[PDB]
Amino acid sequence: QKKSIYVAYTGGTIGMQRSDNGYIPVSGHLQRQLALMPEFHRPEMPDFTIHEYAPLIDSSDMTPEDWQHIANDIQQNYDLYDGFVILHGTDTMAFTASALSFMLENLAKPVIITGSQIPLAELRSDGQTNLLNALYLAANHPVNEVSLFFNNQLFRGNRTTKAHADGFDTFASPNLSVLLEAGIHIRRQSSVVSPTSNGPLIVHRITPQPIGVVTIYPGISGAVVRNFLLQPVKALILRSYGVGNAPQKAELLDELKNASDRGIVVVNLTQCISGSVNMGNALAQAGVISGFDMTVEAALTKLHYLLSQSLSPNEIRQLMQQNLRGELTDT
Amino acid sequence: QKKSIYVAYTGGTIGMQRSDNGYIPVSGHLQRQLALMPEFHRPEMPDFTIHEYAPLIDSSDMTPEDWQHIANDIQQNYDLYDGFVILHGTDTMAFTASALSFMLENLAKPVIITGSQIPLAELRSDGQTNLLNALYLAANHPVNEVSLFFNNQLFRGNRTTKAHADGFDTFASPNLSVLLEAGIHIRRQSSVVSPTSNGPLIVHRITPQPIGVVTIYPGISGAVVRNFLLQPVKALILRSYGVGNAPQKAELLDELKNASDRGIVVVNLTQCISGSVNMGNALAQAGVISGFDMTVEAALTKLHYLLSQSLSPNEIRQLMQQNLRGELTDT
């Protein structure tokens, strides 16, 4: 009972009720259910307080305004609690985790994002396991980062991506070990070091930004790429081949160079599931910068973070390449 | 010696020579090397003939014209040999395999695409293992499909994607079992059935097509998506969340609907590594069709295949959803 954890129920199946025509949201259901589940109220578990969002947020409909609402909620409650669990739908859980990691600078209490495939109230649901363990971990094994908890593993949030969804749900962090394994015996993986706090919590403002995220393929044309870079685009994430290669084709390279010449930030990520971009090539000559081993989620949210501040394109290009929150490995 | 296999050396590290400033292409080197490697000439191995492309093709510079050149080469040599091994750089190997699967209709001899991280001539290279086993498999364990051979596994070509590249190379087929395991003991996985031949080999013509491949993310705007769909775009592949969800946002949906209303084919794939799109939703209402569990490679090359023929947008939308060559699972 000693530790006290804030639970923000933003949306997601985890808190829903079953019906003849699908799982459905029901106000107050999550709290009503938990009151009747004594395992949540054992002496070994922290006290917790639930704030249900109204309306609930469908994670596929999430916008950066919703990222900001969650960051604000953590910030106004920061001193009152020892840690924070955010319940969230699975579809964009990894985007929210990544965004929060950039927004919550100098975070010094644990923030765990989680959810489930099956509502808490069903028999055998992952909802019950995920909430129970996020609460227990936040209180007893705090990791002072934005992390994501799923299938018994605690991932660094800005290293996660959704790995599967059809018939069952699963997350992965392809380029970094988990922070912690939550089986029968909880095991922190201490070779993954958390970002250090250089002062008081600073909560940044993020707004929607016009970013293109596109995939290179054989014969992709200048005209097509030209359209990707039209106003109002401020930045473009390229997903290229292998260690960051693209066609040596003037048509393509001229469009990217003209874009960078007018202030557009162009970031190279790999199409590969894991591994790093390693870039002099013609792409560098065209102003394109390396996204290293970032996930699409981390790159996309990091661009939102940097474009939302008062930074020149050159300042942005430099910071995109620096490890700000543990989201990238640079040699 | 009985079986006879054609080897098309299109490009790739596999046939290169090491130098002080990288691996480099050298005409005739692959043939010269193989002449000196008696394991390739044992009685248990097939005879083989090498056709080195001139110039070699850098796989990151590949275009659909190069897909066509390879398909043509197989077609002119089809009756002369019992099977075909295509040596290829790793960067876009999975695109070529997928494209060839659609182009080579009623294929009734094995076509194996392969390559390596290290040139054949080095000590301990995967180049030597990959060529040796592709030759042996094509002759002794023929699978009459376009397949891709790498890290001791034979994948269905149109189910493959490049899984890693930094520091080492690897391929995966996330939504289907391998066709065959090539360890010490070769094991065909007979629960994966090959497409049947409905007559003589038909080799289709493919030309470059203006296709957008883009990723959905929280708050993505109508203006940005509008630009993705401008002329000359004929088709768009969306990579959406989980089982195929996107923001319920009129701004986004109206742009997609207007595009479909003017003949643009819009295909939904998942951002997830594995699993299937399962779609009535507003995306369906907007004319978007399911790509099921297709890889980006299969969808992109299948669109090239269908756009390159005399088909209406409606005909294309129907065929994109049908399993033509083993590239998708529909329930």
Task: Tell me the greatest interface.
Answer: A-B, 65 and 65 residues
Structural class assignment of chain A: alpha/beta
Question: Roughly what percent helix of chain A?
Answer: 25-40%
CATH topology of the largest domain in chain A: Rossmann fold
Radius of gyration of chain A: 21 Å
Q: Which structural traits does this protein have?
A:
homodimer; 331 residues; alpha/beta; Rossmann fold; 4-stranded parallel sheet; 18 strands; elongated; hydrolase (chains A, B)
Tell me what the structure shows.
Two copies of one chain form a homodimer. The first copy, chain A, has 331 residues and is of the alpha/beta class. Chain A has two domains: 207 residues, Rossmann fold, CATH 3.40.50; 124 residues, Rossmann fold (3-Layer(aba) Sandwich), CATH 3.40.50. The first copy, chain A, is 27% helix and 22% strand. In chain A, the strands form five sheets. An eight-stranded mixed beta sheet of chain A has the order 4-1-5-7-8-9-12-13, sandwiched between helices. In chain A, strand 12 and strand 13 form a beta hairpin. Chain A is elongated and about 65 Å long. The N and C termini of chain A lie far apart (44 Å). Chains A and B meet through helix 2, helix 3, strand 10, strand 15 and helix 5 of A and helix 2, helix 3, strand 10, strand 15 and helix 5 of B. Chains A, B: InterPro entries: AsnA_fam, Asp/glu_Ase-like_sf, Asparaginase/glutaminase-like, Asparaginase/glutaminase_AS1, Asparaginase/glutaminase_AS2, Asparaginase_C, L-asparaginase_C, L-asparaginase_I. Chains A, B: Keywords: Calcium, Cytoplasm, Hydrolase, Metal-binding. Chains A, B: Pfam families: Asparaginase, Asparaginase_C. Chains A, B: GO terms for molecular function: asparaginase activity; metal ion binding.
